[PDB]
Every structure is written in C-alpha cells, then in structure tokens.
C-alpha cells in the first residue's frame, strides 16, 4: 500500500525474538496499511494497537524493521509512504 499507519512508542521494549525490533520511548513506527488489511484490522482498529496485539513495521527512528507489541505504542495518524 501507498499508505502507512503511524505509531509512537510509549515504553522501551528489548527484542525477545529474532524477528522483533527494539523500541525506545519516542521512537516512531510506520505500519504498512496492507499489513493491517491482511490481518483484518484496517476498519478502525489501527487506532487501537493495544487491541491488535503484535504489529510489524518500520522503526523510522532506528531504521530497523520487525515485530513489536502494540500495547507499547500509541496511534498518531497516517501518512503517504
């Protein structure tokens, strides 16, 4: 997709698995809209990452991509990617 949902990390997270990424307070993540379409959460639940569970996206702040817990982040809006 040409669109991304944006999140900001509210807490630090140390990666627990190879596919995970580290989060640091204030990091900004972009989840491709296609990812949430695929999971069935694109009909509004993008704004409730704590209800989705694990997310996969790009940490714009660190340049790393991978899985991170949705309860650790806040939805901040969407952008073109």
């Amino acid at each position: 997709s040409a669109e991304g949902y944006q999140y900001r990390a509210l807490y630090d997270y140390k990666k627990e698995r190879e596919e995970d990424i580290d989060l640091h307070l204030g990091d900004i993540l972009t989840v491709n809209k296609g990812s949430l379409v695929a999971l069935g959460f694109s009909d509004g639940q993008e704004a409730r990452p704590e209800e989705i569970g694990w997310l996969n996206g790009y940490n714009e702040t660190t340049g790393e991509r991978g899985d991170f817990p949705g309860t650790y982040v806040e939805y901040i809006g969407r952008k073109k990617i």
Binding site: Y11, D12, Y13, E16, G53, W54, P69, G70, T71, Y72
Partner: peptide, 9 residues
C-alpha cells in the same frame, strides 16, 4: 496468537 509482554515499570 503470540502472548504480549506486560508493560514495563
């Protein structure tokens, strides 16, 4: 689903 970790603190 993979379990979520609790929030830190």
């Amino acid at each position: 689903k993979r379990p979520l970790p609790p929030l830190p603190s």
